[PDB]
Enzyme design. Structure first.
Site, PDB file in Angstrom:
ATOM      1  N   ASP A 396       0.827  -1.200   0.000  1.00  0.00           N
ATOM      2  CA  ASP A 396       0.000   0.000   0.000  1.00  0.00           C
ATOM      3  C   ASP A 396       0.856   1.241   0.000  1.00  0.00           C
ATOM      4  OD1 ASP A 396      -2.159  -1.663   0.018  1.00  0.00           O
ATOM      5  OD2 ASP A 396      -2.827  -1.272   2.095  1.00  0.00           O
ATOM      6  N   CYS A 430      -0.599   3.353 -12.839  1.00  0.00           N
ATOM      7  CA  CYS A 430      -0.943   3.286 -11.429  1.00  0.00           C
ATOM      8  C   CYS A 430      -1.946   4.408 -11.135  1.00  0.00           C
ATOM      9  CB  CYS A 430       0.283   3.387 -10.507  1.00  0.00           C
ATOM     10  SG  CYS A 430       1.322   4.855 -10.733  1.00  0.00           S
ATOM     11  N   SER A 431      -2.306   4.591  -9.908  1.00  0.00           N
ATOM     12  CA  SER A 431      -3.176   5.698  -9.514  1.00  0.00           C
ATOM     13  C   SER A 431      -2.932   6.966 -10.361  1.00  0.00           C
ATOM     14  CB  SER A 431      -3.019   5.946  -8.013  1.00  0.00           C
ATOM     15  OG  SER A 431      -1.663   6.253  -7.659  1.00  0.00           O
ATOM     16  N   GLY A 435       4.334   7.425  -9.924  1.00  0.00           N
ATOM     17  CA  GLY A 435       5.262   6.890  -8.905  1.00  0.00           C
ATOM     18  C   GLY A 435       5.726   5.465  -9.189  1.00  0.00           C
ATOM     19  N   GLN A 477       8.831   8.945  -7.564  1.00  0.00           N
ATOM     20  CA  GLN A 477       8.283   9.895  -6.570  1.00  0.00           C
ATOM     21  C   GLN A 477       9.171  10.057  -5.333  1.00  0.00           C
ATOM     22  OE1 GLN A 477       5.146  11.990  -6.187  1.00  0.00           O
ATOM     23  NE2 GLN A 477       6.274  12.162  -8.108  1.00  0.00           N
TER      24      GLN A 477
END
Ligand SMILES: Nc1ncc(Cl)nc1Cl
EC number: 3.1.3.48
Length: 499
Positions: A396, A430-431, A435, A477
């Site tokens: 996570d 990704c989101s 990152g 990131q």
């Protein structure tokens, strides 16, 4: 331009600086450096200082009470054009950057160094205009600028300019006195020094300290393990050169196609969508950039939103992509990171003008492979297979402590792409698409060099990251991800020297 970042400031020093050297609207940013990926925005307002937390667990900079940003420089640019847009819990104005004189994150600063050793580095690694700044040895508190100019046939030479530090200012024994070595170095960069017999001491490029021979990655990693943080921050200082326009993303018609309002694709590398619906106002936008290593290319993109799934499949089709790498679960910590844009196993769904068949799913330890068939509705002979590699066990927050699983996954994604004649770029998401996405693409680029050139070849991790960051904002990131890039390559080269 990143002078507002103080990499070695304490909280109390932050406040002191702003009260004594700043005014209302003065600000700086600082690492809260006992939990990497924490930063603080310190800001004067009404004669008090306020400290605002920024958190980065690997996907974006999350400014408490503000917005998410791809880079600290982008964060600062945003608020310096938007007075009243930042506010505490119960507005906080960023007006006046408070400049750091610390030279420690400059590529050209080597600090600890002697003259003969500085000469040998310039003799071996430097070209004309290559320079560095070092501490004096013979004069405690002073500094030296060493520059190369002009086979070792004597056509080139090294020159050593003494830099006096007198009463908190720096000079070259005459003329102007500067508040920092950056200021000195910038000035003589644009107004070069000339020796009396005419040699122009042009400062053209700092001496490369980051390029390693992949053979000896273990040696660098062990040296960086005592460091990784100083090298990462040196790289982050250079992000101020990468504030390229993103005007397509900021268009009102495109606002609802961006997962994060301020994390946007550069105009110059954005994926432009053709063949769109007439009735749509703007139909050519997706939050995606083409990444070209500088051969396999990539598209770095965000996780689909409910209203961009159709666009995502327009993009895969148009770009002829045959491989998709998904680096998040659909949901993590109870928030949507990417909506489900593929059908259930054996099912067939239409996504606007595109049609996708989920032909077969195959579960491995760390990932699932979905064999998808994509075609344009009403147009036979357009069908192609797209392989979606969905990694499921990334943490996570943070990074894995062993790269064995990512490397296995990456090797299999690489083999699949290479097996398909004329395949277009590999889509990685990704989101926010900066990152995890950035980290995966960079490891893939570095490792391809070692696939092609073998173990005795030159790699340069922060140079490769800067190149990909010029093509999408804030690729890679965090320092944790930066270290992970090093540990993955290392683990790759160690299995290669074995077999
Ligand atoms: N999901 C992932 N996120 C980042 C990286 Cl480098 N690799 C993977 Cl497999």
């Amino acid at each position: 331009s990143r002078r507002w970042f103080h990499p070695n400031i304490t909280g109390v020093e932050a406040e002191n600086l702003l009260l004594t050297r700043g005014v209302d609207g003065s600000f700086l940013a600082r690492p809260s450096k006992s939990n990497p990926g924490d930063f603080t925005l310190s800001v004067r307002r009404n004669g008090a200082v306020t400290h605002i937390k920024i958190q980065n667990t690997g996907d974006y900079y999350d400014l408490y009470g503000g917005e998410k940003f791809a880079t600290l420089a982008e964060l600062v640019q945003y608020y310096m054009e938007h007075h009243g847009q930042l506010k505490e819990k119960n507005v906080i104005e960023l007006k006046y950057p408070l400049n750091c004189a610390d030279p420690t994150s400059e590529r050209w600063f080597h600090g600890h160094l002697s003259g003969k050793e500085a000469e040998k580095l310039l003799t071996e690694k430097g070209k004309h205009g290559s320079f560095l700044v070092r501490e004096s040895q013979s004069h405690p508190g002073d500094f030296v600028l060493s520059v190369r100019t002009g086979s070792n046939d004597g056509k080139s030479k090294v020159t050593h300019v003494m830099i006096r530090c007198q009463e908190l200012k720096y000079d070259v024994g005459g003329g102007e006195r500067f508040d920092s070595l950056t200021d000195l170095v910038e000035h003589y960069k644009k107004n070069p020094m000339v020796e009396t017999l005419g040699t122009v001491l042009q400062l053209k490029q700092p001496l490369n300290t980051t390029r390693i021979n992949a053979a000896e990655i273990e040696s660098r990693v062990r040296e960086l393990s005592k460091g990784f943080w100083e090298e990462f921050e040196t790289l982050q200082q250079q992000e101020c050169k990468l504030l390229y326009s993103r005007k397509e993303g900021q268009r009102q018609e495109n606002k609802n196609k961006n997962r994060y309002k301020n994390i946007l694709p550069f105009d110059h590398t954005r994926v432009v969508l053709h063949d769109g619906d007439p009735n749509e106002p703007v139909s050519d936008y997706i939050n995606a950039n083409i990444i070209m290593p500088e051969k396999k290319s990539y598209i770095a993109t965000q996780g689909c939103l409910q209203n961009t799934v159709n666009d995502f499949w327009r993009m895969v089709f148009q770009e002829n992509s045959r491989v998709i790498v998904m680096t998040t679960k659909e949901v993590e910590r109870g928030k949507s990171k990417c909506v489900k844009y593929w059908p259930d196993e054996y099912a067939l769904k239409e996504y606007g003008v595109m049609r996708v068949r989920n032909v077969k799913e195959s579960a491995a330890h760390d990932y699932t492979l979905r064999e998808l068939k994509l075609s344009k509705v009403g147009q036979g002979n357009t069908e192609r297979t797209v392989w979606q590699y969905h990694f499921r066990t990334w943490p996570d927050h943070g990074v894995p402590s062993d790269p064995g699983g990512v490397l296995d996954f990456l090797e299999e994604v690489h083999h699949k792409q290479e097996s398909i004649m004329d395949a277009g770029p590999v889509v990685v998401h990704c989101s926010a698409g900066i990152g995890r996405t950035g980290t995966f693409i960079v490891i893939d680029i570095l490792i391809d060099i070692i696939r092609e050139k073998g173990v005795d070849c030159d790699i340069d991790v922060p140079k490769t990251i800067q190149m990909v960051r010029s093509q999408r904002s804030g690729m890679v990131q965090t320092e944790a991800q930066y270290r992970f890039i090093y540990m993955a390559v290392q683990h790759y080269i160690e299995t290669l020297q074995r077999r």
